[PDB]
């Protein structure tokens, strides 16, 4: 089931990069987290909204360098 | 198992919806070909785990100016260039060149093939 | 790296219809893209980045109002869909997935539309409803070699959205291959340096700009630094930017320094009547240079 495999690999990579962005408020982690969240399938709709809310919350806190 | 996997990928075409990761049992999917491509089969193939026989996109025909100028021929209505599967194309000779009777100047388009008639000078 | 003190004017408010709105997104999106990948935000003012991101959000959601039900795009909803506008929106949004949130189904619906409806049997993409603002399309306005240049443009936009639409569009690889087949077939017959540059970038993305085709690309450059044709210099800047991106894909870093030198020596900082393709490509190429810098 390589389809569902990749469907979940996109999710975990988005989770790790969003966590890295939350820990490192930088432009690099912002771009990587945004690209990773956008590539998550329509299946995990509510989970995508959660991670996108977390990216927006980090952007409200501000970022450095 | 009783559900279904991914829809079969056809050539020169694709499904008409967002590709699901897992497909439900008994659901049919619509297929569409590219431009001028003629479909041959049921556009909606139904879902056990094995999908129904997907339809086939029959290729069309591209009549380029290169092949025609090499044969010293034009079109009767000189210029659509593109022809669908079965559209009859009517060629004519060019100035000075006369027909060689190699093929009738009314050519059918089957899949990809299309036989070009020729014209020769005196 | 170009000083960001000049680029302050590229921060605009997206306002317009199905076409002006993209002319408004283009400078804001490409400026944030440039400053991110060049690491000049601290000296230019990082506090402005968040505000510029909000501007990009506006253009995104505003453009969604012109998304026809066929997933295509046009200046109005009841107007005929444009192939170039759909390809350009795909291109701008594919760069914007690194900045704001974007719905994947929108881009992929537009890609499926371009593949199924607006690709001809020989892989050519056809513009059946030209845009109203022929100044936003750059050197592609010229009629000569319109088939080659439009196919290259759509192909570049498809290969940019590859990351986002690989899972949902299975016809994408075949369509990309058919477009590259047409480009490779009629590349050596090209006479226009703009088409040589944009088709060279498209083939280089596919790994096809090799052999005599590659030679034609590199020999089209005058003084080995620019790709120019008789016409407006905005077209020549767009072409040289496409060529720089092709070179960066080709990893021919011994050819790049003169081209970047010429691009910097033009002192082009964006703006001007119909400067959309010029601004987008020049700063896309410079940003990708700083990212792929040797």
Swiss-Prot record, chain A:
It comes from Staphylococcus aureus (strain Mu50 / ATCC 700699). The gene is fib. Extracellular fibrinogen-binding protein that plays an important role in virulence. By interacting with the alpha chain of fibrinogen and its derivative fibrin, enhances a non-functional interaction between fibrinogen and platelets and is responsible for repression of fibrinogen-dependent platelet aggregation. In addition, assembles a fibrinogen protective shield around the bacteria which results in impaired phagocytic clearance by the host. It is found in: Secreted. This is Fibrinogen-binding protein. Interacts with host fibrinogen alpha chain/FGA. Interacts with host complement protein C3. Coiled coil: none annotated.
UniProtKB/Swiss-Prot annotation, chain B:
Expressed by the liver and secreted in plasma. It is found in: Secreted. Residues 2-59, 60-120 form the Sushi domain. N-glycosylated. Disulfide bonds join 4-47, 33-57, 61-109, 93-119. Involved in complement regulation. The dimerized forms have avidity for tissue-bound complement fragments and efficiently compete with the physiological complement inhibitor CFH. Can associate with lipoproteins and may play a role in lipid metabolism. Head-to-tail homodimer and heterodimer with CFHR1 or CFHR5. This is Complement factor H-related protein 2. It comes from Homo sapiens (Human). The lineage of its organism: Eukaryota, Metazoa, Chordata, Craniata, Vertebrata. The chain holds residues 146 to 270 of 270 of the full protein.
UniProtKB/Swiss-Prot annotation, chain C:
Changing residue 36 to A: Minor effect on binding of C3d to CR2. Changing residue 39 to A: Impaired binding of C3d to CR2. Changing residue 49 to M: Impaired binding of C3d to CR2. Changing residue 163 to A: Impaired binding of C3d to CR2. Changing residue 291 to A: Impaired binding of C3d to CR2. There is a cross-link at residues 17-20 (Isoglutamyl cysteine thioester (Cys-Gln)). Changing residue 101 to V: In AHUS5; leads to impaired binding to the regulator CD46/MCP and resistance to cleavage by factor I. Disulfide bonds join 108-165. Interacts with CFH. Interacts with CR2. This is Complement C3d fragment. The gene is C3. The chain holds residues 996 to 1287 of 1663 of the full protein.
């Amino acid at each position: 089931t390589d389809a569902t495999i990749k469907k979940e690999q996109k999710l975990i990579q988005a989770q790790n990069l969003v966590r890295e962005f939350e820990k490192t408020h930088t432009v690099s982690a912002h771009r990587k987290a945004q690209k990773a969240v956008n590539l998550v399938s329509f299946e995990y709709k509510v989970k995508k909204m959660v991670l996108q809310e977390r990216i927006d919350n980090v952007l409200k806190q501000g970022l450095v360098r | 198992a009783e559900k279904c996997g991914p829809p079969p990928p056809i050539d020169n075409g694709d499904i008409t919806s967002f590709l699901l990761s897992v497909y439900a049992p008994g659901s049919s999917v619509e297929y569409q070909c590219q431009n001028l491509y003629q479909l041959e089969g049921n556009n909606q193939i139904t879902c056990n785990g094995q999908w129904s026989e997907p339809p086939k996109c029959l290729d069309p025909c591209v009549i380029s100016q290169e092949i025609m100028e090499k044969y010293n021929i034009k079109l009767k209505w000189t210029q659509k260039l593109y022809s669908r599967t079965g559209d009859i194309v009517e060629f004519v000779c060019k100035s000075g060149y006369h027909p060689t009777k190699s093929h009738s100047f009314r050519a059918m388009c089957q899949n990809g093939k299309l036989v070009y008639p020729s014209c020769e000078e005196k | 790296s170009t000083d960001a003190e000049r680029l302050k004017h590229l921060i605009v408010t997206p306002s317009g219809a199905g076409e002006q709105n993209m002319i408004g997104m283009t400078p804001t999106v490409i400026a944030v893209h440039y400053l991110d990948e060049t690491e000049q935000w601290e000296k230019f003012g990082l506090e402005k980045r968040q505000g510029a991101l909000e501007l990009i959000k506006k253009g995104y959601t505003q453009q969604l109002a012109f998304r026809q039900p066929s997933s295509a795009f046009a200046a109005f909803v009841k107007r005929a869909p444009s192939t170039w506008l759909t390809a350009y929106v795909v291109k701008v949004f594919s760069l914007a997935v690194n900045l704001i949130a974007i719905d994947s189904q929108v881009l992929c619906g537009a890609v499926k539309w371009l593949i199924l409806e607006k690709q001809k049997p020989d892989g050519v993409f056809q513009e059946d409803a030209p845009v109203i603002h022929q100044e936003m399309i750059g050197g592609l306005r010229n009629n000569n070699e319109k088939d080659m240049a439009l196919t290259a443009f759509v192909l570049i936009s498809l290969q940019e959205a590859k990351d986002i639409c690989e899972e949902q569009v299975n016809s994408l690889p075949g369509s990309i291959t058919k477009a590259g087949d047409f480009l490779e077939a009629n590349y050596m017959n090209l006479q226009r340096s703009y088409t040589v540059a944009i088709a060279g970038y498209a083939l280089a993305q596919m790994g096809r700009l090799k052999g005599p085709l590659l030679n034609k690309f590199l020999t089209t450059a005058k003084d080995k630094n620019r790709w120019e044709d008789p016409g407006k210099q905005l077209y020549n800047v767009e072409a040289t930017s496409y060529a720089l991106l092709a070179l960066l894909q080709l990893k021919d870093f011994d050819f790049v320094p003169p081209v970047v030198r010429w691009l910097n020596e033009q002192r082009y900082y964006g703006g001007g009547y119909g400067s959309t393709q010029a601004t987008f490509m020049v700063f896309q190429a410079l940003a990708q240079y700083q990212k792929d810098a040797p």
